[PDB]
Amino acid sequence: VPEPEVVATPPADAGRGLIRVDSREIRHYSGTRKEPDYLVSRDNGKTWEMKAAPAGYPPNYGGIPKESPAIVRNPLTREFIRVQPIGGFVFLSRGGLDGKWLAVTNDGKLEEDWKDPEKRKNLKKLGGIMRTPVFVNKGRRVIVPFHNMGGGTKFHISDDGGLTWHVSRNGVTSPRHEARPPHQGVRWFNNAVEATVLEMKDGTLWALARTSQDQAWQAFSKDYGETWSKPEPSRFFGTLTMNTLGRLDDGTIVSLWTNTMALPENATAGNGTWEDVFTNRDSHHIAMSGDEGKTWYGFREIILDEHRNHPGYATLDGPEDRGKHQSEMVQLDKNRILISLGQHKNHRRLVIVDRRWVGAKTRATQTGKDLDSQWTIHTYIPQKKGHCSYNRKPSAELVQDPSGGTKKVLQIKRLDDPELVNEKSNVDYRNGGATWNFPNGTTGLVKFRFRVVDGEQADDSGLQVSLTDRLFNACDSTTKDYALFTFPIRLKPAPHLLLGMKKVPFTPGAWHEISLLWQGGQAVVSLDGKKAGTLKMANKSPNGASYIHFISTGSQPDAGILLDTVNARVK
Ligand SMILES: [Ca+2]
Ligand SMILES: [Cl-]
C-alpha cells in the first residue's frame, strides 16, 4: 500500500480553488491578478499542467494573489458558486465552469455584464474573511463561514442558491490564551476563526474552528446554521492553524489539520493582538471516522516540510508565510484522496493519500535511512525573520555506528551553540531531540534501540522519552508535562532508567532496546526483553498515542545518546 505521493505544486496556497470537473479532470484555480488560469489534471490527479481560463470566466476582482477563490458545486443544479477569501463578488455559473458566469446584485438579481466597472458598483459584497461555501438542508441552503477582526466566526446564509443573503444569529467563539507557565506571554488571539463545516447524517451541522487554545474548538447547529451551541474543545490538537472536514462517497469522514503543539510563548510575545512567530506549521495530518465521528483512526503525518531544518528557512524566495498548514481535499477513487496543502510556492503541495495507509496498524524506521522523510529534529535560531518565522538548524546529526558496519545513527545531545539562545525573550533551544509519528492507538507497543555515546557527559545528561498525541518540537523540553506517558533515561551517576523512584541500570558502550507496551492508563516498560517497571498515564488523551518524542536533558554540552531503530504496532 503506497505512502503519500507528491504529484504537483498548486498555483495558490492551499485551502480554496481545488475542484473536480468530471471523472478525469480536476482543476486548482489561482489568485492571479492577471488573466485567470488554473492547474489542471486530465488523468484523475496523477499529472498536472497550467492552463488559461476561457474568456467567460471572471477575473479575481477580490481576493489576494496567493489565494484562489473558493469554487463549490451546487448539488441540486450542478452549477457552481464562487466566492473569494476576502472581497469581491458572488459568481454563479450557467453551463459549467467554462460556461456563462453571472454576478449577484444587491437586489437579488443576476448581472451578466460584470466586465463593466460601473455595473460592478451594485454587486453583492459578502463581508469578512470567508472560507468554503457548503450546501446543507437537502441542498436547499448554502452557508459561507466568515470571520471579522474580532467577533468570531459567523455564517453568510442563502436560501435561494446565492441570490439573497443574511447572517446567522450567532456563530463560534473561543477563549483568549493566558500567559501561565510554561508560557511567558500571550498567544496571538484568534476568536474561533477559519471554520470548516460538515453536515452530519442526522442533519446537525458541525463547525470546527481555529483558536489560540491547544486544540481547535467546535460548535453544532440544529437549524442549519442560524444558531450554534456553546463552543467546546475538539479532539483535534493544533493552535492557530486551519482545519478541513470532508466526507467520502461511502460516508466516511475525513479530518485534515496540522496536529502540532507550538513552542511555549516567550517573554517578548505581545499582548496577543499580533503574532511574533509560528513554530508549529511544518506538518499536516489526516484522521478518518466510519461512524459519524464517534471513533477515529489514523492521525498520520501526510508530509513533513522539506525545508524545516534550513538556516535560511524564513527568507528563501521572499519573506511571506510558508509551511504545511491549510488544506483542501477531493476524493479520487475508493482508496485514494487528493489533498492540496501548505503555503508558499516552495512548500505548497498536491499529495495523493491512500485510505489503506491511513488505517495501517504498524510503522518502522531507522534514523540513518529515514531522517529526511520521517523525523522532526529541527531547533530554532530564536531571532525573528521574515513574516513571523524563525530560521532553523538540525538539532541532531547522523554519525557512524560505533559497533562497525554501515548504519548511520542519530546523536541526540545538549548542543554548544549560542545562536540558539535569546536572553531577552528568555528562551534556550540547545537541547537536541527527535520525534516520529505512528498510527494512533489507545493500546500499542513501541520499541526503540539506543546507545550511550562514549564521551563526556553532564550531571543531568540523558534522554526524556514521551508518548504524545500530537507533534511536539524536537527542542521542546516541556513535552513531558503534556505527554500521555513519559520517563527519563539518566546517564549519571551511572546509566539507568528512572521509573518512578526505581532505578534500572544498563550498560554504556552497548546497544539496548526499550519497549513501551501501553493499554488504557498504564504502560509497561521493558529493557532488553526484561520487564523494568510500569508507568502511570500522566495525561489523558481524547485519541491515543501517535508520536514518540525524545529530547536530551543535559544543561551543559554533553555527548548524549545514539538512536537507531523505532518500531510501532497499535490495536
Ligand atoms: Ca506568539
Ligand atoms: Cl495566519
Author numbering: 25 to 595
Question: What are the paper's exact sentences on this?
Answer:
Mucin glycan utilization requires the removal of protective caps, notably fucose and sialic acid, but the enzymatic details of this process remain largely unknown. Structural analyses revealed an unprecedented fucosidase modular arrangement and explained the sialyl T-antigen specificity of a sialidase of a previously unknown family.
Sequences of Amuc_1547 and its close orthologues populate a separate and distant cluster in the GH33 phylogenetic tree. Based on this as well as structural and mechanistic difference to GH33 sialidases, described below, the enzyme encoded by Amuc_1547 (AmGH181) is proposed as the defining member of the CAZy family GH181. To explain the strict specificity, we determined three structures of AmGH181: in ligand free form, bound with the transition-state inhibitor DANA (N-Acetyl-2,3-dehydro-2-deoxyneuraminic acid), and bound to both the T-antigen disaccharide (GNB) and DANA, which provides a mimic for a transition state-like substrate complex. The structure comprises an N-terminal catalytic domain joint to a C-terminal CBM-like domain. An inserted B domain between β-strands 1 and 2 of the CBM-like domain acts as a bridge by packing onto the catalytic domain via an extensive interface. A long loop in propeller blade 2 forms a Ca2+-binding domain. The catalytic site comprises a shallow pocket, flanked by a positive electrostatic potential. The active site is open at one side of the β-propeller due to shorter loops as compared to GH33 enzymes. The Ca2+-binding domain, the B domain, and two large loops pack onto the β-propeller to give the enzyme a “sun-chair” architecture. This conformational change positions W298 to stack onto the GalNAc unit of the T-antigen, thereby defining subsite +2.
